[PDB]
Amino acid sequence: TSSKIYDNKNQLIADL
Amino acid sequence: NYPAYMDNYLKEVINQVEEETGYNLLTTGMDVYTNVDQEAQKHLWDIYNTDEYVAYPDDELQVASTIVDVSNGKVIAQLGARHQSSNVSFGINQAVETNRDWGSTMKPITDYAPALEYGVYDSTATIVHDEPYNYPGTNTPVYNWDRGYFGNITLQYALQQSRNVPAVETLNKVGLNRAKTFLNGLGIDYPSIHYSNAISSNTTESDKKYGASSEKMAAAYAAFANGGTYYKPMYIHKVVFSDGSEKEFSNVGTRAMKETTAYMMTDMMKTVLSYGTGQNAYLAWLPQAGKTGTSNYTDEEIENHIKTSQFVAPDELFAGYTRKYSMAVWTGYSNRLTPLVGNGLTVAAKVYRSMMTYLSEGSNPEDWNIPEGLYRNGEFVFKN
Numbered sequence A: 001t002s003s004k005i006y007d008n009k010n011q012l013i014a015d016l
Numbered sequence B: 001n002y003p004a005y006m007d008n009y010l011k012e013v014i015n016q017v018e019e020e021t022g023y024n025l026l027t028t029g030m031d032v033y034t035n036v037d038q039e040a041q042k043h044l045w046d047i048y049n050t051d052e053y054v055a056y057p058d059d060e061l062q063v064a065s066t067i068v069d070v071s072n073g074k075v076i077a078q079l080g081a082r083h084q085s086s087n088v089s090f091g092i093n094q095a096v097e098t099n100r101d102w103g104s105t106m107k108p109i110t111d112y113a114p115a116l117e118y119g120v121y122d123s124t125a126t127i128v129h130d131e132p133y134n135y136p137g138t139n140t141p142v143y144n145w146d147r148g149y150f151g152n153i154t155l156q157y158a159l160q161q162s163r164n165v166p167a168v169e170t171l172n173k174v175g176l177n178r179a180k181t182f183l184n185g186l187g188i189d190y191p192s193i194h195y196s197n198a199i200s201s202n203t204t205e206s207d208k209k210y211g212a213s214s215e216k217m218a219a220a221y222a223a224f225a226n227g228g229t230y231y232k233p234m235y236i237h238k239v240v241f242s243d244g245s246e247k248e249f250s251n252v253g254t255r256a257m258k259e260t261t262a263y264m265m266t267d268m269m270k271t272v273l274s275y276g277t278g279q280n281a282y283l284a285w286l287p288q289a290g291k292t293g294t295s296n297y298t299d300e301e302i303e304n305h306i307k308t309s310q311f312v313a314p315d316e317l318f319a320g321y322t323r324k325y326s327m328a329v330w331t332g333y334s335n336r337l338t339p340l341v342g343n344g345l346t347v348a349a350k351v352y353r354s355m356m357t358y359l360s361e362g363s364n365p366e367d368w369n370i371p372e373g374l375y376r377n378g379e380f381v382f383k384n
Ligand SMILES: *C(=O)[C@@H]([C@@H]1NC(C(=O)O)=C(SC2CN(C3=NCCS3)C2)[C@@H]1C)[C@@H](C)O
Pocket: B102, B103, B104, B105, B144, B145, B161, B162, B164, B199, B200, B277, B292, B293, B294, B295, B296
């Protein structure tokens, strides 16, 4: 339902 | 919602999360932490989709590439297509696809490295043979690109000029089984291996892992870069589950070749860029190695679909690495029957040059140190 994706610097890049 | 340039990277993340966890992140709530360097990935997108870095011949010429951190096998950038006016989410990612022929980029990993590893050759100066030659147990000739033959030449010069005969003959001397085992240690498999695979990633299945993609080549070459250890391409660093659990992925490697093999391969592949076929990737300030690749059409294809005596190719390929990063670049058209021509054949190397410039500029680019077991002599490197 609510999955968050972070880059190598731990900053959000996607919300799926 | 998510940015467009990340579409390819996310698709692999989604696939890699459920391979390790069994959970699809689109149907289960979890926070996923990835290896993508956002700034580098944006720059890759800039190179593909603007005029700033590369002079493309037209807007349908395709580029797929993967950049890997050589110390851990973390995929730090990946873009499978350029100019895609059809926003379906998580479509075909060409960067992990193994259905295009990687041609001459197979030579270092299938032929010359194994020959050095298993001690078939002893130096980069070993006299190898570019003479009329048939695929072992057949009447089909192994042609060079120019239909000519250089004769008695050094190993180094063979790889550098990218001759076909010495490559195929080398595969015969290493042996098919021995070579298959070597390729497996570098993350590459075939259901069946044949002598044409000395100069081709062409395979029967490619349903899954069979053959070569920019992903697999990046990982394979990364071994040369780090003294001969293979790491599995990693897109995910850490998952935290809806129920508070956390699973961290540590990246452990496997010895794929002796450090001397790695070094010797690197030392030869340095010249591809300086004196050889890789000159559009050359950078005076950057210790880097690489191999070019130009696949070709079949007998059926030349006769029926390709009409020209100009130099053409379905696929143009580069695979290079520095001390820190490894990059494999595939170029071509969606329809393989649209041939690369003139300037289009230089894209692959220029895309590499541009991305590598970005990644290495500002650091102290270290060269490779000649390891215990090898010694220098003139242009070449010898064993003990
Ligand atoms: C490998 O991909 C093929 C083989 N290697 C190769 C390359 O790109 O290294 C070519 S292109 C050939 C070299 N070149 C030159 N132009 C000016 C002087 S040298 C065009 C060649 C097709 C293998 C599968 O045949």
